[PDB]
Amino acid sequence: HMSELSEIDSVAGVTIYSVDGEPKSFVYKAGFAIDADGAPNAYAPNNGGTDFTANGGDDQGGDWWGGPVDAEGYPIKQKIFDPFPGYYVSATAHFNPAYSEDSPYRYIDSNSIPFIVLPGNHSNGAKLGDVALVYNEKTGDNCYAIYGNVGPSSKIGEGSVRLAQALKIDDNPKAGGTESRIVVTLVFPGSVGKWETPKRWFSHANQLTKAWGGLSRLKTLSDQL
């Protein structure tokens, strides 16, 4: 059965719809850019990371948005007890408060955690840590994910390296992702709104998805978008 959809927002030519009914959710069909933010091997001096260093900004004291910086504006380098010593600490907007701002463990590791990015100013009621169901209409693959980072306000359709793997999308931060609008993202705003273990939020995503009607309902909905 088709779903009843009501437009709530629009970004970069992609319409965002409230899905009428309960539990509360919104949905959009978009491409999928790779966000390697939070991965502890994303950024390093001299293009040593999985992304080119300049994709995080200027690592010589200029504008650097890839992660935290020291008192002179240079990116914080990981320590001997961090996953990739000497690489830069890459940050995500969602964080684990158990760890300090200079720690890679504070941020969501894009390599290991399925997460979506929502455009800045376009969260549509979702809070970081809320859960989502993500579906690739071309591969039939799906995955639960958290809202883990905030993207440019003018860009939509983006998520983590691990989410790309789960969806069978090229996961390479330098050349992966897709511009084809093949990914359907169903967000449950208000579902979590805090950091918690992946086992816990994945379970909650599973319970919400079951209550909502399951992947079968999202598959039918995908044909409407």
Numbering used by the authors: 0 to 224
Paper text:
We focus on AMGs that potentially encode chitosanase enzymes that metabolize chitin – a common carbon polymer. One expressed protein showing endo-chitosanase activity (V-Csn) is crystalized and structurally characterized at ultra-high resolution, thus representing the structure of a soil viral AMG product. The structure consisted of two non-contiguous structural domains. Our rigorous analyses not only resulted in a crystal structure of a soil viral AMG product, but also enabled us to propose the mode of action of this previously uncharacterized chitosanase enzyme in the GH75 family of glycosyl hydrolases.
Based upon a partial alignment of the V-Csn, A. fumigatus, F. solani, and S. avermitilis sequences, the corresponding residues in V-Csn are D148 and E157. Two V-Csn constructs harboring either a D148N substitution or a E157Q substitution were generated, and the activities of the respective mutant enzymes measured. Activity was reduced five-fold for D148N and almost eliminated for E157Q. Both constructs eluted with gel-filtration chromatography retention times identical to native V-Csn, and circular dichroism spectra indicated both constructs were folded. In both cases the carboxylate was converted to the corresponding amide, generating the mutant proteins D148N and E157Q. The two mutant V-Csn proteins were crystallized under the same conditions as the wild-type protein, and their structures were determined by molecular replacement to high resolution. Superposition of the two mutant structures onto the wild-type apo1 structure gave RMSDs of 0.11 and 0.07 Å, respectively, for all Cα positions, suggesting very little conformational differences between the mutant and the wild-type structures. Co-crystallization of both mutant proteins with chitohexaose (a β-(1-4)-linked polymer of six D-glucosamine (GlcN) residues) gave a complex with the E157Q mutant only.
